[PDB]
Design a protein around this ligand. Structure first.
Ligand SMILES: *[C@@H]1O[C@H](CO)[C@@H](O[C@@H]2O[C@H](CO)[C@@H](O)[C@H](O)[C@H]2NC(C)=O)[C@H](O)[C@H]1NC(C)=O
Length: 497
């Protein structure tokens, strides 16, 4: 309905400019008839999820790479896609004029947008906050009577969430995660640095911390927001590091194990929020399979864990088979979910690179890798950040799919936004990954999945400079003659009935 107004800032591609009165959007979804396929294409040259169609014939005119859908090879069912509603994000979003605000929320949650169905919510402050604070900073209040939500919640986050859900295409799931607990429950009495919970699992320190979760869920419930799940702790391994710069809370796998077993699990289960799911780890994938082993081989702990939440820093290496692969192999019935993703973390990398194609490619390549290794969902970090990748109270700036320029009541949707959309918009909840074999060695990254209604969706990413002609074969309908342009990403969709 409205295309991308491109704008280059000096990197491999362009970003799409949006403002109070305009923003590139999609038309209502149309489902092409059997025999025809839909293709959404994005390219480093400038194409942005442009819709085109073609025919699925019975003639195989292709003579190069062939990807054949294998509908009967079923894998994990997809939970969803989303990003985090951090203090930083709500701050940047609410700093645009009401109309720009809605165009931005629409870009993410609407069907005219890329249909996010997941929102991660920090439990109080993290580094993408403009100040340190918790929901109960009044010292030694074990009964948690001075527990309350600050303005960041009641004024910024909760209102943006109500609004995203209100514009949301499909149902949205809320995932919560705490960075640090009140400093008076910690061995070091500081929101950051190296320190963990005081005492040992089962004590009053641990019972209070677990209650803090229920208090939180009661608070948000009072605001008419229910959570799908909460994590045991954001990056618990961070608190084991001396000098850790921002809000954290160390836990060793053992500590986490017993904490969940003796405190978190029971507490949640015995409350009105017992249906909320609990995810363990919520830390970098290199800590797997080991963390899973420790926590999950203990049935008192594992009876409470619904899934293993993982994080990743795209600029870094972390072979998936040895981590995500092995973990599935050891605990096939415990879902793997991606809760945080990052780019521009390494000290020399510019936090934000407006229009970076490399960063987009990294996002999709990472979602494909996650999807190929059993992950049921993929959650982005900050929904939006300013041009410097902030605000971040310890200057730990990174990039974000949407960059807000408050001085121009303008926001820019980066290549990452679209690479995320290529999945988020076409892989609804309940979609199930199916097989997809390549006839030969190729430089493409691809993944196929079947919608709940039975329709197909294949995402093909080409991180190479050369075009790769290819045919997709669906044994129930025919062949899709097509081409994967260099530095591009396509999403194909088609009925099978
Ligand atoms: C928001 O962005 C739109 C798109 O660039 C701006 O509208 C364009 O403005 C130019 C120059 O005035 C016109 O030649 C085009 O016809 C407009 N395009 C469309 C489709 O409207 C708009 O000016 C921007 N809003 C503000 C407040 O600057």
């Amino acid at each position: 309905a409205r295309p991308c107004i491109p704008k280059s800032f000096g990197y491999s591609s362009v970003v799409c400019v949006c403002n109070a009165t305009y923003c590139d959007s999609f038309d209502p979804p149309t489902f092409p008839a059997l025999g025809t396929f839909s293709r959404y294409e994005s390219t480093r040259s400038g194409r942005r999820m442009e819709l085109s169609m073609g025919p699925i014939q019975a003639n195989h005119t292709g003579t190069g790479l062939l990807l054949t859908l294998q509908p009967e090879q079923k894998f994990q069912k997809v939970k969803g896609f989303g990003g985090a509603m951090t203090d930083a994000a709500a701050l940047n979003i609410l700093a645009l004029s009401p109309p720009a605000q809605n165009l931005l929320l629409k870009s993410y949650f609407s069907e005219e947008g890329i249909g996010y169905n997941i929102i991660r919510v920090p439990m109080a402050s993290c580094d993408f906050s403009i100040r340190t604070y918790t929901y109960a900073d009044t010292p030694d209040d074990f009964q948690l009577h001075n527990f309350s939500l600050p303005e960041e919640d009641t004024k910024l986050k909760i209102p943006l969430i109500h609004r995203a859900l209100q514009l949301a295409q499909r149902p949205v799931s809320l995932l919560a995660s705490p960075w640090t607990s009140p400093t008076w429950l910690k061995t070091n009495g500081a929101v950051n640095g190296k320190g963990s919970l005081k005492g040992q699992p089962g004590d009053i320190y641990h019972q209070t911390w677990a209650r803090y979760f229920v208090k939180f869920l009661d608070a948000y419930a009072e605001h008419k927001l229910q959570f799908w799940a909460v994590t045991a702790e954001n990056e618990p391994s961070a608190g084991l590091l001396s000098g850790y710069p921002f809000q954290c809370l160390g836990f060793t796998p053992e500590h986490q194990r017993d904490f969940i077993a003796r405190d978190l699990g029971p507490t949640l289960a015995n409350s009105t929020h017992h249906n909320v799911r609990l995810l363990m780890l919520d830390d970098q994938r290199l800590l797997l399979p080991h963390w899973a082993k420790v926590v999950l081989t203990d049935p008192e702990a594992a009876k409470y864990v619904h899934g293993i939440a993982v994080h990743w820093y795209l600029d870094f290496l972390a072979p998936a088979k040895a981590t995500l692969g092995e973990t599935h192999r050891l605990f096939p019935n415990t879902m793997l979910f991606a809760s945080e993703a990052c780019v521009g973390s390494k000290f020399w990398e510019q936090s934000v690179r407006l229009g970076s194609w490399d960063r987009g490619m990294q996002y999709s390549h990472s979602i494909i890798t996650n999807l190929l290794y059993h992950v049921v969902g993929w959650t982005d970090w900050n929904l939006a950040l300013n041009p410097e990748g902030g605000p971040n109270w310890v200057r730990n700036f990174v990039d974000s799919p949407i960059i807000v320029d408050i001085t121009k009541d303008t926001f820019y949707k980066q290549p990452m936004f679209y690479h995320l959309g290529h999945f988020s918009k076409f892989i609804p909840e309940g979609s199930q990954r199916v097989g997809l074999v390549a006839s030969q060695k190729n430089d493409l990254d691809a993944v196929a999945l079947m919608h709940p209604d039975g329709s197909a969706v294949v995402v093909v990413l080409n991180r190479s400079s050369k075009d790769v002609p290819l045919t997709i074969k669906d044994p129930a309908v025919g062949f899709l003659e097509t081409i994967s342009p260099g530095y591009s990403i396509h999403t194909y969709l088609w009925h099978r009935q």
